[PDB]
Write a protein that binds this DNA or RNA. Sequence first.
RNA 1: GACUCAACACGGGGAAACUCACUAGUUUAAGACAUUGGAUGGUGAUGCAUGGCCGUUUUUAGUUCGUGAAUGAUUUGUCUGGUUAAUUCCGAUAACGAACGAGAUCUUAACCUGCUAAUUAGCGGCGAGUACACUGUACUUGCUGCUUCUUAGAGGAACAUUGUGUGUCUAACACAAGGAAGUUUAAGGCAACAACAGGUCUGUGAUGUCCUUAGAUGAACUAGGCUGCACGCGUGCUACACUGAUAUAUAUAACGAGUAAAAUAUGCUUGCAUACUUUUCCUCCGCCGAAAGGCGUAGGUAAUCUUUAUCAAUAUAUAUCGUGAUGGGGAUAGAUUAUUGCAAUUAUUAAUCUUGAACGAGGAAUGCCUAGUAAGCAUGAUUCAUCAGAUUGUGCUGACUACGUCCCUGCCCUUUGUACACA
Lengths: 67, 48, 154, 79, 157, 98, 41, 138
Amino acid sequence: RVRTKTIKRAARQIVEKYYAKLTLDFQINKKITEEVAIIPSKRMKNKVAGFVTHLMKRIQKGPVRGI
Amino acid sequence: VHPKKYGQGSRQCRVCSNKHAIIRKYNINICRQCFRERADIIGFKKYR
Amino acid sequence: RLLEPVPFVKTNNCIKDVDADLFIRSYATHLKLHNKITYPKWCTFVKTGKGRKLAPLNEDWYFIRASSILRRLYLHPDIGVGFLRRQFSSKQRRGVAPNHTSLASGKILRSILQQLENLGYVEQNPKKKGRRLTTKGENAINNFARYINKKVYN
Amino acid sequence: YSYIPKQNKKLIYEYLFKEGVIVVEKDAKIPRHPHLNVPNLHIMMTLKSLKSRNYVEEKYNWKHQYFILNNEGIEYLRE
Amino acid sequence: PISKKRKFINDGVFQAELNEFLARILAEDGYSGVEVRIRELTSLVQKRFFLCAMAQAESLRYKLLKGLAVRRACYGVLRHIMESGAKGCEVIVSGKLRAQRAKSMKFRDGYLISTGEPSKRFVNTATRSAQLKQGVLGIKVKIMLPTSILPDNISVL
Amino acid sequence: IALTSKNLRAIEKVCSDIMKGAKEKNLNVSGPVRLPVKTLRITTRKSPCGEGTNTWDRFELRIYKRLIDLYSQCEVVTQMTSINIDPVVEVEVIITDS
Amino acid sequence: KLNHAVFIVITPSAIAEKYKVNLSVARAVINHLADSQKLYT
Amino acid sequence: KRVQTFGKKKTAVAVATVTNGKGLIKLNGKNLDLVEPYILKTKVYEPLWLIGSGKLKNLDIRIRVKGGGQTSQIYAIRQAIGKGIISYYQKYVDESTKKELKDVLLRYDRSLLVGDTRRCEPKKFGGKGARARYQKSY
RNA sequence: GACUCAACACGGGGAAACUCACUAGUUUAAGACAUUGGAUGGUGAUGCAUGGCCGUUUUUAGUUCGUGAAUGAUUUGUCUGGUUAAUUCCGAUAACGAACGAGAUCUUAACCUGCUAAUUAGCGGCGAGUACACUGUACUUGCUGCUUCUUAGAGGAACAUUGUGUGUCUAACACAAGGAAGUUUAAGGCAACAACAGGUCUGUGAUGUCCUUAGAUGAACUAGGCUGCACGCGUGCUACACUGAUAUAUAUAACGAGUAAAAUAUGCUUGCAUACUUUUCCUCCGCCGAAAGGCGUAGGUAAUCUUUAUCAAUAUAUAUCGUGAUGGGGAUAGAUUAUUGCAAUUAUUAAUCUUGAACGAGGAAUGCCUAGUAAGCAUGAUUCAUCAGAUUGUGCUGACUACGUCCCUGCCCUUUGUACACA
């Protein structure tokens, strides 16, 4: 399924500014990513927000390569 | 002269001046050879 | 095997509540016994349809069509001459050429329609141009439907 | 034969003059033009003849001529 | 008394006439618009019926037809596109080009999206052709209008 | 009053104008009618020569038609539409009483 | 080839093999004994 | 009082009107046994048993037939009647048995309550078959 | 014209007058311009002069830049390896950072906003009932509470979501559950870098150059071939049967597409000239005729009329037959009734009958096939004066199977060897 450089760099770009409002729940993370984002394609916004969720479940349990 | 209102010689292409491969669908009477490039100027797009 | 268990409540008020094949055969026998129409002899040497290309081989096909025409007339409030042709359209294999659907002959159905018109079972009016069945025919077919239903019930 | 009476030539000339704008159609066998009550076989030859005399220019198109009176074409063609 | 279905194809025929007529008549300047010079145009039209990519492409076609070198003409026109505002321009010219062997030169600069329906919607096209002593020249000018925002263009403030 | 076109937003905004005018003039205006969108499909093949893998492409025409009705004077509406219509949109006016 | 005739379980296939008869005359014999393919009563 | 629901699998359609009455469950004009094929009649009988003949005796269902093949029409009728009984239990007759009825319907299968998206795809290129190609020569 | 994929139901090519670039022939100037001077057109030649277009490589994933770095052609970036729809990424990295192609995005099917409503659509209510139930029903005719249902404007839902797991614990994928949606939910269209001496100047008043022009290589007119065959090779249709040959009855859809002329009368002497409606599409009707087809007509420039509360078929049930090339089979020609076409003869199209070939499921071999999909069954559109057995759009019958691999084949990378570079 994977993703592209656009998603991989959007995930790095976001979080670093509004991670506090980010929560553990997938749907709430979807909502915050959607409202901060401006990209008008909901499908790939959902894809990038799922990427964000799987990157947030990596936090608080070891180094996460940036952020 | 012997002009007839029926058959292949009843009408010819309105642009390409050749009556072969005329499409009469929807009463266009334009030859397809030119219509391939006339599709966009008429505004008749290809999507799928 | 013809009768089957039914869980819902029946009404038994018309031929719509009875199966098509049993009613059409019962009414073919009814008209054969009553002698209301002719055979007719002129239809004998013509097959049912152009696509059929062969004799039906049942000796009562005209009466079966006579019992089914008004059966479809009750079902549809308005019909046409081509309606029967389309309903009884059959396969036609033009030799080497492949099969296509084709309508049956229209003169025989026109003639039997004239026969029931003479019988009075069907009427024509400027309004509702399609064929409809008259009020007397309605109660006649209703009584016949309930009359077969009562024997086939118990 | 198809001899042209002078009436056709003078009529087409004055029809150029009064309208200022003129189209004569590339087809040749049409008996009559929607805005011209004159056979169209005898107008294509005259239009091409006048064009070849360097008095009118023709942008031209497929099955269309788009003729127009030049600033110098009227004066010679008056009489 | 005509249907809408045949009416719209009659209108399509009318616009087929109009596109080529506008292409022929609009030669000395850009695209000044259409009406629903002017006096003659209206008279002929009524008689018969009863940032500018096209302009820039016609300019380059004129520069090639006048006998000016393709390299310098293309470089100049590309500079005018860049200073007009398009993020880039894809211009390709084909023909004999001084030899008996067919050839083409492609000038690449910038993003230059080349396929996809959003690309087709954002990017406008121009392709012209003209005669030459021993052949015919073909020029293609692809101008991309500034980007709503592209889905790939992502940034967070 | 029925309007027909090919593109989407040009008739949506005109119908929005119809609705806002109806609300402003408090007319006996019936609800919007959403006719099915009809599509017309023709065929044409690429490869102008005879050789090559013959390929066939399909273009579509998406016709549109939406109806409304109002109980008012025809002159005011036939001016109001011409005020805020586009050349690519066509309308036909039919009046009603109740 | 066939050599079945009409002159001398109730399923037609079984009784046709039993009596060495054609299927049509087998159906006729079944009707005679009792008094397209169908299930049993 | 009354409820109106819908059911569509494949090209066939079905609209079901469920109303109080004496059990006049009529498919337009014809009854549910006189269709001719008993194979589909068994499937039509299937949802009746899971709910109750005594319960259905108190309600009339007006069922309309329009379009589709035999299997498609029977599936659409089954969806229409399932949604009708579920909505009527949710609305008028009784809520306590609605949960049990919907649970048993879900357990038995998924196609009884809501149909399937399985449909015909637009024809691609290559052959007469929807995924076939012409027998290329050599 | 075209010669493996990349031709051989292709040139839209289902060829009765031109039509056709061809033939037996007959005509015209219709050679613009200033006897004569003097050109356009051309289906003549050249796709080995071209443009555009297309068909391939090639539906795969490759191409390029700036800088840097390693006499030169050049190398790196563009990669050990792990994942993938793909240099798609993770990662070690003389590379780092960029542009393309990929991606992504959208129709349609698909679930929902008891949103949003009603034309030409649906659900109801009552004014009068046709007959029965019983203390409403199958069907009409007139009006309107309302719009999930006939339809659709935007939007949302779906994101490996969650949980049990593998993984350099990073990038990933598996099962199950919620969920219509777990291979991007699936078919599609856009198709680069670069090339073919592939096709097309027979598609263009797009097209250079050599060629014709009064006895035309311009145009028009009579007849003919492309439809003939000693034969060979492709795409398809019908079949070789009893799950079948055949007749009756009922249960059935989507895409659909649809209006410079007929006839009447007058003059002259059926023909020409003149004016009136619109006859110039599908057609429902009532008849004529088995049918074809005709007659006077409803409707409609179109969810209104064809016609779609309905257009087919394999099915469903009973019947003649009951696996014998048979009555399966329908090649073949003969007798003809009507339409299409001023022209059906090389019997177009066609209702009827007779005529009765092979065919026991097809060898060496090949093509298509991963789920409304194989396969079978049909239907609409195109070119049409008439004619699908062609191509395309749609619906029905819903299957046998994997859910991966390089052993065949076609492509790709790396390494290596070359005396190949038109490779």
